[PDB]
Design a protein that fits this description.
Shape of chain A: globular
Bound molecules: 2-acetamido-2-deoxy-beta-D-glucopyranose
Structural class of chain A: mainly beta
Protein name (chain A): Alpha-2-macroglobulin
Strand order of the largest sheet of chain A: 5-4-7-8
Distance between the termini of chain A: 73 Å
Number of strands of chain A: 47
Keywords (chain A): Bait region, Disulfide bond, Glycoprotein, Isopeptide bond, Protease inhibitor, Secreted, Serine protease inhibitor, Signal, Thioester bond
GO molecular function, one term (chain A): tumor necrosis factor binding
Subunit structure (chain A): Homotetramer; disulfide-linked.
Oligomer: part of a larger assembly
Family (chain A): Belongs to the protease inhibitor I39 (alpha-2-macroglobulin) family.
Chain lengths: ~725, ~50, ~50
């Protein structure tokens, strides 16, 4: 029939004054279960005594919280007391408490600045979740690099979860990075720099275009080179692109003319557009032993004569690996339960593998050889029927393992890319489980995604019942987010491999969707594994800007129409996109503010974790066992059953086969920035009405380029909103 | 020295920088302790005159 | 017939028990400490290889 099964999964990482989910498993009914997690202390004082009602075949997860911890972090041996009427179970484990503070970020117009103008900046505040947070701060101060605070404001308060500023600057700075500092009450620090320099505006510029990587077998090549005095004035003249294999690590103690090969090409500049030249790849004879072909150019201008020189792409790209293939979606976890589908493609030079090149698929130690070929639209979607032990390893381009290592003597070795993978087994003594192929593809938001899960039941279900439960759980960077319960009338002694599973995607999840699914058995055994999926950037308060359409300069009258959630305190940084096209905004974006959130996922055992056990840690528990032997206390494997709780980041107190300790006995072995007008265009704060506040924008005439608005809406009605990119010409 | 009198009294100045000027003056007055004379006088470097 | 790695079924319920043995004097040997051999269904199942 069954046994009692309790399994109260727990993420040890805690978060203060913010919701963290806590659930419990129970099934195969018996007398009475009222399990209670209590931080074990000499007195019942620090005990977060969380007595959870536990009936059978339910998932009513409870989001119990904690108050401020004494220190910032701390270890407290925590036990779930299985509060039966005649049954009590105790297994301690240290709790990774953490006085997590609310998160804040800084926003800056630019980092470079001209000496003499007014630097103006914004700082923002939110919490664990992605809503604003109005909060006081001890102090904030801009820093000059000599260990002195160049700006400083005192104990202000945020008006809407943020605050703007306008700070002057002296025209004689140390031309370099100036830093801003914040310190919360607990001591959380954030950083946002800005450079300064009286950089001269050069009325002269030159550019060389050459492919970075190029394989041996190529027909021809293009190199666009052009000297243009302001990047927008295609000039006449003559240019010559010269390239030369000189050496790999030449010393010139020999003093010989280092040039090994040289291929010279010259051409008169084009008056319209910027000049193009064709070079071929055979004339180089870019042989293996042959050496570094530096990529440089020489431009001479007719009618003026001021011949400046540039070494552009001067350091070339030694492609010691030719025809370099890779992996694509080599499966995260190999299982017998379905033919897994690892994936491999090939990239080369420009990035086009040979059409319908047949590949040598050998997943060895399973001895399933089945060649395939790269499809124009499909990659290799392959499988190997394993009939073997846990040890498996695969590779393609498998004419050998090593090339023919008679010797290299470190002279030079012939290494082409071969994509070899080593894999390991689910330590499933039941030999029954569900394999979940990865959803590592595009994933648009605001919908639901049915995952595809295929499973087995080896030896049938030995007794089972009409109904066996298969719940699926999504841990999320130290905590669970959603619940899911599903089952299927299990056929007793025949294998089936179609399991239905689905989940919605909006927001409010770690950058990875750590799904988990397990097979609760009546026999005190449960098998599952991790299920990682991408989380694509999709925000709460979707907002789109709009402007009075692009026309001539003097029309100072204009609009900057923004339409978002009905209420928000929003930033309006309508500025130039020249200062974004010269440098992408790696610091400021939607996906940026997503990944700036620290503690991305505290997986497994943290450093502060102090060991935990009662009896298993006792070395040499060596007597009276009805087997050939009695070996390590550990659950050791790469994908053991408890390694899945480890890769989650959660622990468990379970009558089934889970926990292992750490300390206790385990075996082993088996320069300058090109610049244009930095004159900022728009800077002001507003508050959106319901119909969409339409601010009359001002045209900044005598400035034609690409223009951009680094807007930022923050609101507690719809969370934060951003018009990440919308174009003005 | 008189940056002390400039922090609040202006209502326009940036007192962050004079609050840092007094941070420099916390070493300045020790320099004066080192630029003093035993008899009571002052010079560029101190005593032995 | 038997080997030490065989019986790929459920593991000990507390910890994992991989495969190993003892150096003590054994039962199959007591047939050889008598000085002879035999053929049996009773268990002599211990480290062959
Ligand atoms: C119906 C019922 O309570 N059955 C058993 C109970 O007898 C036992 O004491 C306990 C621990 O094994 O698990 C349950
Ligand atoms: C919760 C509880 O009863 N345990 C003790 C309580 O008796 C005591 O008054 C308090 C003083 O800090 O510390 C705690
Ligand atoms: C690149 O070179 C090839 C071969 O000469 C030619 O087909 C192609 O038009 C060239 N493109 C440019 C832009 O020079
Ligand atoms: C590749 O596999 C196919 C499918 O069985 C087979 O027909 C073909 O002979 C194989 N190609 C080679 C390398 O012979
Ligand atoms: C091989 O794939 C089959 C399904 O075609 C599966 O039933 C089997 O478990 C896999 N490996 C073996 C033969 O154990
Ligand atoms: C600050 O300066 C003003 C003059 O600008 C002066 O009246 C006041 O006493 C000073 N200190 C205080 C009390 O704010």
């Amino acid at each position: 029939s069954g046994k009692p099964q309790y399994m109260v999964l727990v993420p040890s990482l805690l978060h203060t004054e913010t919701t963290e989910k806590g659930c419990v498993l129970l099934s195969y009914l018996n007398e009475t279960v009222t399990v209670s997690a209590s931080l074990e202390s000499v007195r019942g004082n620090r005990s977060l005594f969380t007595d959870l009602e536990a009936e059978n075949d339910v998932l009513h997860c409870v989001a119990f919280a904690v108050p401020k911890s004494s220190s910032n972090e701390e270890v407290m041996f925590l036990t779930v007391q299985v509060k039966g009427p005649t049954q009590e179970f105790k297994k301690r484990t240290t709790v990774m408490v953490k006085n997590e503070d609310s998160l804040v970020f800084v926003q800056t117009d630019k980092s470079i600045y001209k000496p003499g103008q007014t630097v103006k900046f914004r700082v923002v505040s939110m919490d664990e979740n992605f809503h604003p947070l109005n909060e006081l701060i001890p102090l904030v101060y801009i820093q000059d690099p000599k260990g002195n605070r160049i700006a400083q404001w005192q104990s202000f308060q945020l008006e809407g979860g943020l605050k703007q500023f306008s700070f002057p600057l002296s025209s004689e700075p140390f031309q370099g990075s100036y830093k801003v500092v914040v310190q919360k009450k607990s001591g959380g620090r954030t950083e946002h720099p800005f450079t300064v320099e009286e950089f001269v505006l050069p009325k002269f510029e030159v550019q060389v275009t050459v492919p970075k990587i190029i394989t041996i077998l190529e027909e021809e090549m293009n190199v666009s080179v052009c000297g243009l005095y302001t990047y927008g004035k295609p000039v006449p003249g003559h240019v010559t692109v010269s390239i030369c294999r000189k050496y790999s690590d030449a010393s010139d103690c020999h003093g010989e003319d280092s040039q090994a090969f040289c291929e010279k090409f010259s051409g008169q500049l084009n008056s319209h557009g910027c000049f193009y030249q064709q070079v071929k790849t055979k004339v180089f004879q870019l042989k293996r032993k042959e050496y570094e072909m530096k990529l440089h150019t020489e431009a001479q201008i007719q009618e003026e004569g001021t011949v400046v020189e540039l070494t552009g792409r001067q350091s070339s790209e030694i492609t010691r690996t030719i025809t370099k293939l890779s992996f694509v979606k080599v499966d995260s976890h190999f299982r017998q339960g379905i033919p897994f589908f690892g994936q491999v493609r090939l990239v080369d030079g420009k990035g086009v593998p040979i059409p319908n090149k047949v590949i040598f698929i050998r997943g060895n130690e399973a001895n399933y050889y089945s060649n395939a070929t790269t499809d124009e639209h499909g990659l290799v979607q392959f499988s190997i029927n394993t009939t073997n032990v846990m040890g498996t390893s695969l590779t393609v381009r498998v004419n050998y393992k090593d090339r023919s290592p008679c010797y290299g003597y470190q002279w030079v070795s012939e290494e082409h890319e071969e994509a070899h993978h080593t894999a390991y087994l689910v330590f499933s003594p039941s030999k029954s489980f569900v394999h979940l192929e990865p959803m590592s593809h595009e994933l648009p938001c605001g919908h639901t995604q049915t995952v595809q899960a295929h499973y087995i039941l080896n030896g049938g279900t030995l007794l089972g019942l009409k109904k066996l439960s298969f719940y699926y759980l999504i841990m999320a960077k130290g905590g669970i987010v959603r619940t899911g319960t599903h089952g299927l009338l299990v056929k007793q002694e025949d294998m089936k491999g179609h399991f239905s599973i689905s989940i919605p995607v909006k927001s409010d999840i770690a950058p990875v969707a750590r799904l988990l699914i397990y097979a609760v058995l009546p026999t005190g055994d449960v098998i599952g594994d991790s299920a990682k999926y991408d989380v694509e950037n999709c925000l709460a308060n979707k907002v789109d800007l709009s402007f009075s359409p692009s026309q001539s300069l003097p029309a100072s009258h204009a609009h900057l129409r923004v339409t978002a959630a009905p209420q928000s305190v929003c930033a309006l940084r309508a500025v130039d996109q020249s200062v974004l096209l010269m440098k992408p905004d790696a610091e400021l974006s939607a996906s940026s503010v997503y990944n700036l959130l620290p503690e991305k996922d505290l997986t497994g055992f943290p450093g502060p974790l102090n060991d935990q056990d009662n009896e298993d840690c006792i070395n040499r528990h060596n007597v009276y066992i009805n087997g050939i032997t009695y070996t390590p206390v550990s659950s050791t494997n790469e994908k053991d059953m408890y390694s899945f709780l480890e890769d989650m980041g959660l622990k468990a107190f379970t009558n089934s086969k889970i926990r292992k300790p750490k300390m206790c006995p385990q075996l082993q072995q088996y320069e300058t920035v090109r610049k244009y007008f930095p004159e900022t265009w728009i800077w002001d704060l507003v508050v959106v009405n319901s119909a969409g506040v339409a601010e009359v924008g001002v045209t900044v005439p005598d400035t034609i380029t690409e223009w951009k608005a680094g807007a930022f809406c923050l609101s507690e009605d719809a969370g934060l909103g951003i018009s990440s990119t919308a174009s003005l010409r | 020295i008189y940056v002390l009198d400039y922090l609040n009294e202006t209502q326009q100045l940036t007192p962050e920088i004079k609050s840092k000027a007094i941070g420099y003056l916390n070493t300045g007055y020790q320099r004066q302790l080192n630029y003093k004379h035993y008899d009571g006088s002052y010079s560029t470097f101190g005593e032995r005159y």
